[PDB]
Amino acid sequence: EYGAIYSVSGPVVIAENMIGCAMYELVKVGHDNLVGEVIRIDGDKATIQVYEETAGLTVGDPVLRTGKPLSVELGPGLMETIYDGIQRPLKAIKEESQSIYIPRGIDTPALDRTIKWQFTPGKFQVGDHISGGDIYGSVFENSLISSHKILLPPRSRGTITWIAPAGEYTLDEKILEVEFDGKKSDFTLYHTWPVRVPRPVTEKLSADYPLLTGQRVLDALFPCVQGGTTCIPGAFGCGKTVISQSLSKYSNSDAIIYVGCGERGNEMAEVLMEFPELYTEMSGTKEPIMKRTTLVANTSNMPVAAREASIYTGITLAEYFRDQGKNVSMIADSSSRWAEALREISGRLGEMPADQGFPAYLGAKLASFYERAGKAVALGSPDRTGSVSIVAAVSPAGGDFSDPVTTATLGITQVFWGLDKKLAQRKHFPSINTSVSYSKYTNVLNKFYDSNYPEFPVLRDRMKEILSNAEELEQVVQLVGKSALSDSDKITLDVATLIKEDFLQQNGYSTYDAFCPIWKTFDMMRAFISYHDEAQKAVANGANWSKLADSTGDVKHAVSSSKFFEPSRGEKEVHGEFEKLLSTMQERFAESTD
Amino acid sequence: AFIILDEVIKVTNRRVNAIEHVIIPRTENTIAYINSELDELDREEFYRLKK
Amino acid sequence: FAINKKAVEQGFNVKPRLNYNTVSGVNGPLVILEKVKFPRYNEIVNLTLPDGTVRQGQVLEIRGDRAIVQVFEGTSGIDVKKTTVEFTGESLRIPVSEDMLGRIFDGSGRPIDNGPKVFAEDYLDINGSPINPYARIYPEEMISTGVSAIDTMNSIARGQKIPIFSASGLPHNEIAAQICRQAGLVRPEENFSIVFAAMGVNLETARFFKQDFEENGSLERTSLFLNLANDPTIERIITPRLALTTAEYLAYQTERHVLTILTDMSSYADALREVSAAREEVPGRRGYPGYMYTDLSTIYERAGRVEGRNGSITQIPILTMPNDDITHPIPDLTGYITEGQIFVDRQLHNKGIYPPINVLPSLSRLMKSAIGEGMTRKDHGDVSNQLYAKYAIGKDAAAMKAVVGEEALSIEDKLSLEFLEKFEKTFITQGAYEDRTVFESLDQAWSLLRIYPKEMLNRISPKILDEFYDR
């Protein structure tokens, strides 16, 4: 029933006596049980792909069959875990081996098989008809998340003849007996799923609810809807780590799945050392972020197939967590590396190249992968709802954006947050080049603004035109100097500078400017536009703007200092203070005109 | 001196504008075309070797 | 301590060795046995030609009862009637002992210092398993190269991987020799060691390396793996694996801060293209194999500090761009895998500047973790930026000098013009045997900075300006 090796060639192996094997089964080739997958079947012999190094193999070694394609186990215990590209626990492996290597031919359960979990029955009873995707019990996973639900895997129906009652169990105790034509069906606290097949869902919806990150510029001018895609350039000096950290700590999501898809290694060490120290404070300083995140690490040494399947694994995990009714936020690291791995695999298979040497799959693969994102209502009885929002990170070949990867990604995604290094030295620490970055979810977000903040769109637009006008104005200012410019032009210029240095720039470490909520930013841009338009109106009827600036230097300083105002104090008393400041500015301008 | 400076600056400014607005686009389009052709050749060479 | 039980268990067990005479065809650098029994991929074999000469090889493929051996030292003189092929029964292994230091090894690891055998303390598989990422940490402290233009502006934190790009006809080898000779830690040594593996080099360069390392005493801190140009290519691809394996053993089983150098990778790329042509894998981009990314990653990414052990490791691969273009695949991949790069300009070399390094394109991403207090003085990070900015300004100032005279230039422009020449002629220009500590280089940089008025050095913090600008 086993298979004897018949040939070997680097990473290529040919089995024998293989009858009754699918085209993508998994096989435990070798005495050490190296993992592999069948590719081509020709009668009895079948080509096999290996992951580890094949040195030392010998003809006649038995070959086994797993019985499924590449799959990932899902269940309680994912949180606080650090995984390889192919669902391999690294902490447990290191502890078990006591070495500092990944000893080839090592197999340990993806999830711990010893920790006892306290299960609580759901809402069904014996003899009740059931359908796939229906919740039938919860589990307390952490103080942060305590409602880790238990589903019935899709493609499974029937009636339940026995359900275990409350108690404490491990992951190897059948807690349900679904009866069908064959009553063989048993179920435990976990199950598996092929990675390459998208999870079934009742129906997709239209994402409209905004995703707020806590930054000012992001949600002010280039918002991302909670459920959509986005892209940000990958550079060394840009310092994207700030964006990822802020998204992890201050966003309104409920589960983060960071994916390292091939890095220099040392960067992986840095991020792994850093994450367990980031702290969030909601209803008290809930110490870790690891209690809300699972991380997939893939250094360059990792096997090519593992380095390639990383994003598929991550997105599958995200979809699983979405179907529980929670909100998820995937974050890739370098899609360029994933494309590199895909091209390397294609080349090793010896297939026809395409544009710039890449294969022909890239377009379709990326399109499908991105389409896997979105917002939908889960598949089950309770009718919960979730959402997924991928955040890609494209790195170029050598800076140029002519590569197919960048073109396809930009064509697919909807939001781009351009980062510039030049701002780094000037320390606009949120280093967003406002002349390039853009968003396309405004048309939907207006249907939320009107319900909550009707004036937001006109204000954000107004500052968009203000910034464009100021940057254009400076061009001719250099040519002819400010001398030949009217007072209105100088007003535009200086208000643009004030906005640049207050509204956009953000320390990110001060207790007050670390995390700016929505209403606070609402008040800020309202106040800034009011100041500018009131000043220009006052100048319109006739007045030397120099004298006006001399009179209202205090008002300008007050509006600037309003940014230093500490939020998290009343969250409506702040609104009262902002109203007081606005009225004070109005009456000060009125008196100044006199 | 005023007349000479005026004419000199006019000439140099127009020359700079002409260079920027004509030469660089013309040469970089050719760069892209050459890159495309040299990428094309290897494709058929690889096909032949594969055959 | 129980390692003795394992050593004896697999130690005192002799096994026989087959011997074949069924050579049944040959194709260039290959050889095709016919009726092998239970072959084993990637074995080691010892051919015996009819004249009594002896060679070696390593299988590549196995059909049903067949092997395809490739011989290291060519294939001429073999025969299909009298040659006898002897199998080994286990892959290539290296003899490892603490006392490599001082000795010189050939490409395959046979000592060539006219000394006794290694007296191995153990045996190992050359290509070990990858490091577990979860058990890895960040660089922290600095390594003292002794070169002014490197340490001051491109410090190397232990655990980094900084390649040194260079052109064909440049003195990169001399720079590498000087670096290996002057390396060491910083004391604001009983823990330092170097591995210096050279692949694909002339005879003159090898002799110069040996003679210089002999009479300069550095030999007993190093262990060279020389491989001349006329030696088999397979041995070439093998050599870096041996060097990395021995360095890893030392670092992570004796807790020694070690530094490794390679002195070339283009010739490694050539040796690699040669393989997969013996096989029928069609050529990839620019003729190179497509899958070089994986194996180059394997070579490089056995570096960095480790969680538990106190040891460490560092790499300085040396490339050679064919026609001085970064677009070539080799430098592209190396930059992709490694952190920052060090350039070597041709023009500076033409002007007699040694080491002919240009700093404008240079970069080291882990600097920020290298400099600091205790680990070094407090003013390194500011002087670095200041000097970089002023050099960049001086270049363009010299450019404009020819077009707009000299008087129209601002006072800043004249000062920068003078500073550029002074910097080039004094700071970077370092004697072949002039060794400088980081402190001395910092002092010289301060001396050069003293050209400008105190106020104008904007990028430097006022605190440092007040503290050190005096005198």
GROMACS .gro file of N, CA and C in nm, chain C residues 159-218:
model
  180
  804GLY      N    1   2.648   4.055   1.366
  804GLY     CA    2   2.525   3.996   1.318
  804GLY      C    3   2.474   4.056   1.189
  805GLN      N    4   2.547   4.151   1.130
  805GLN     CA    5   2.506   4.212   1.005
  805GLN      C    6   2.561   4.131   0.887
  806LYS      N    7   2.518   4.169   0.767
  806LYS     CA    8   2.564   4.107   0.642
  806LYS      C    9   2.579   4.220   0.540
  807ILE      N   10   2.699   4.276   0.532
  807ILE     CA   11   2.725   4.392   0.447
  807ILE      C   12   2.818   4.352   0.333
  808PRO      N   13   2.768   4.338   0.211
  808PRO     CA   14   2.857   4.308   0.099
  808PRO      C   15   2.939   4.430   0.059
  809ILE      N   16   3.043   4.404  -0.020
  809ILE     CA   17   3.135   4.508  -0.066
  809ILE      C   18   3.143   4.495  -0.218
  810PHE      N   19   3.060   4.570  -0.289
  810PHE     CA   20   3.066   4.570  -0.434
  810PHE      C   21   3.198   4.629  -0.481
  811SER      N   22   3.246   4.580  -0.595
  811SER     CA   23   3.370   4.630  -0.652
  811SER      C   24   3.373   4.594  -0.800
  812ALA      N   25   3.458   4.664  -0.874
  812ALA     CA   26   3.472   4.640  -1.017
  812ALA      C   27   3.584   4.540  -1.041
  813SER      N   28   3.604   4.505  -1.169
  813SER     CA   29   3.699   4.400  -1.203
  813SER      C   30   3.841   4.437  -1.161
  814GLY      N   31   3.896   4.542  -1.221
  814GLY     CA   32   4.034   4.579  -1.197
  814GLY      C   33   4.053   4.674  -1.080
  815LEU      N   34   4.005   4.634  -0.962
  815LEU     CA   35   4.016   4.715  -0.842
  815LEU      C   36   4.087   4.637  -0.732
  816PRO      N   37   4.149   4.706  -0.637
  816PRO     CA   38   4.225   4.636  -0.533
  816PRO      C   39   4.138   4.588  -0.418
  817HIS      N   40   4.026   4.522  -0.451
  817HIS     CA   41   3.938   4.472  -0.347
  817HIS      C   42   4.008   4.370  -0.259
  818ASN      N   43   4.093   4.286  -0.319
  818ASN     CA   44   4.160   4.182  -0.242
  818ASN      C   45   4.251   4.242  -0.135
  819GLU      N   46   4.323   4.349  -0.169
  819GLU     CA   47   4.408   4.415  -0.071
  819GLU      C   48   4.325   4.472   0.044
  820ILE      N   49   4.211   4.532   0.012
  820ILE     CA   50   4.124   4.585   0.117
  820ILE      C   51   4.076   4.472   0.207
  821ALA      N   52   4.037   4.359   0.148
  821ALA     CA   53   3.993   4.246   0.228
  821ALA      C   54   4.105   4.196   0.318
  822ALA      N   55   4.227   4.187   0.266
  822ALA     CA   56   4.339   4.144   0.348
  822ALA      C   57   4.362   4.240   0.463
  823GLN      N   58   4.358   4.370   0.436
  823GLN     CA   59   4.377   4.468   0.542
  823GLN      C   60   4.268   4.455   0.648
  824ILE      N   61   4.143   4.435   0.604
  824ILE     CA   62   4.033   4.421   0.699
  824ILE      C   63   4.056   4.299   0.787
  825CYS      N   64   4.086   4.185   0.726
  825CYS     CA   65   4.111   4.064   0.804
  825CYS      C   66   4.228   4.083   0.899
  826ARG      N   67   4.326   4.164   0.861
  826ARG     CA   68   4.443   4.185   0.946
  826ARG      C   69   4.414   4.277   1.063
  827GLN      N   70   4.327   4.377   1.044
  827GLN     CA   71   4.306   4.481   1.144
  827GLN      C   72   4.176   4.465   1.222
  828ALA      N   73   4.100   4.360   1.198
  828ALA     CA   74   3.971   4.345   1.265
  828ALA      C   75   3.990   4.334   1.416
  829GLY      N   76   3.879   4.343   1.487
  829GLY     CA   77   3.879   4.333   1.632
  829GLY      C   78   3.762   4.407   1.692
  830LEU      N   79   3.740   4.383   1.821
  830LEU     CA   80   3.632   4.449   1.894
  830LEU      C   81   3.676   4.590   1.934
  831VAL      N   82   3.595   4.656   2.015
  831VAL     CA   83   3.625   4.788   2.069
  831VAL      C   84   3.621   4.778   2.221
  832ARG      N   85   3.723   4.833   2.287
  832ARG     CA   86   3.731   4.832   2.433
  832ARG      C   87   3.720   4.975   2.484
  833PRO      N   88   3.602   5.019   2.529
  833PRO     CA   89   3.587   5.157   2.579
  833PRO      C   90   3.657   5.178   2.713
  834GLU      N   91   4.224   3.912   2.226
  834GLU     CA   92   4.103   3.945   2.299
  834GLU      C   93   4.035   3.819   2.351
  835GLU      N   94   4.081   3.703   2.304
  835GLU     CA   95   4.037   3.575   2.357
  835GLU      C   96   3.897   3.537   2.311
  836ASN      N   97   3.829   3.628   2.240
  836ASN     CA   98   3.694   3.603   2.192
  836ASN      C   99   3.677   3.627   2.043
  837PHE      N  100   3.783   3.658   1.969
  837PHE     CA  101   3.771   3.691   1.828
  837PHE      C  102   3.835   3.584   1.741
  838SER      N  103   3.772   3.557   1.627
  838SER     CA  104   3.824   3.462   1.531
  838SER      C  105   3.774   3.503   1.393
  839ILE      N  106   3.847   3.460   1.290
  839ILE     CA  107   3.817   3.497   1.153
  839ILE      C  108   3.824   3.373   1.066
  840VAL      N  109   3.734   3.365   0.968
  840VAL     CA  110   3.738   3.262   0.865
  840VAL      C  111   3.745   3.332   0.731
  841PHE      N  112   3.848   3.299   0.653
  841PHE     CA  113   3.881   3.371   0.530
  841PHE      C  114   3.889   3.269   0.416
  842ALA      N  115   3.776   3.247   0.350
  842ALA     CA  116   3.767   3.151   0.240
  842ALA      C  117   3.770   3.225   0.107
  843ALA      N  118   3.862   3.186   0.020
  843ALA     CA  119   3.878   3.247  -0.111
  843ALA      C  120   3.853   3.142  -0.218
  844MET      N  121   3.772   3.178  -0.318
  844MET     CA  122   3.734   3.087  -0.425
  844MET      C  123   3.760   3.153  -0.559
  845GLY      N  124   3.826   3.081  -0.649
  845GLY     CA  125   3.852   3.131  -0.782
  845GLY      C  126   3.945   3.251  -0.782
  846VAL      N  127   4.072   3.228  -0.747
  846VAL     CA  128   4.171   3.335  -0.739
  846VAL      C  129   4.296   3.292  -0.815
  847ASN      N  130   4.374   3.391  -0.857
  847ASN     CA  131   4.500   3.365  -0.923
  847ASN      C  132   4.598   3.299  -0.826
  848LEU      N  133   4.708   3.249  -0.882
  848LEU     CA  134   4.814   3.194  -0.798
  848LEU      C  135   4.887   3.304  -0.722
  849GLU      N  136   4.912   3.417  -0.788
  849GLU     CA  137   4.984   3.526  -0.722
  849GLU      C  138   4.907   3.576  -0.601
  850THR      N  139   4.775   3.592  -0.615
  850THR     CA  140   4.695   3.640  -0.503
  850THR      C  141   4.699   3.541  -0.387
  851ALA      N  142   4.691   3.411  -0.417
  851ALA     CA  143   4.697   3.312  -0.310
  851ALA      C  144   4.831   3.316  -0.238
  852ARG      N  145   4.940   3.324  -0.314
  852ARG     CA  146   5.072   3.331  -0.252
  852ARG      C  147   5.085   3.457  -0.167
  853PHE      N  148   5.034   3.570  -0.217
  853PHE     CA  149   5.041   3.694  -0.141
  853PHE      C  150   4.960   3.683  -0.012
  854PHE      N  151   4.840   3.625  -0.019
  854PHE     CA  152   4.761   3.604   0.101
  854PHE      C  153   4.838   3.522   0.203
  855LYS      N  154   4.892   3.408   0.160
  855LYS     CA  155   4.962   3.321   0.253
  855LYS      C  156   5.081   3.392   0.316
  856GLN      N  157   5.165   3.455   0.233
  856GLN     CA  158   5.284   3.521   0.284
  856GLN      C  159   5.251   3.636   0.377
  857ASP      N  160   5.147   3.714   0.346
  857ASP     CA  161   5.112   3.826   0.432
  857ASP      C  162   5.056   3.778   0.565
  858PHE      N  163   4.965   3.681   0.562
  858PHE     CA  164   4.910   3.628   0.686
  858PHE      C  165   5.014   3.554   0.769
  859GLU      N  166   5.122   3.507   0.706
  859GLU     CA  167   5.226   3.438   0.781
  859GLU      C  168   5.306   3.535   0.867
  860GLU      N  169   5.367   3.635   0.805
  860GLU     CA  170   5.462   3.721   0.874
  860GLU      C  171   5.396   3.834   0.952
  861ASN      N  172   5.264   3.849   0.944
  861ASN     CA  173   5.192   3.949   1.022
  861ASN      C  174   5.122   3.890   1.143
  862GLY      N  175   5.148   3.763   1.174
  862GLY     CA  176   5.096   3.702   1.295
  862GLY      C  177   4.947   3.676   1.297
  863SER      N  178   4.871   3.730   1.202
  863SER     CA  179   4.727   3.711   1.202
  863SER      C  180   4.687   3.566   1.178
   0.00000   0.00000   0.00000
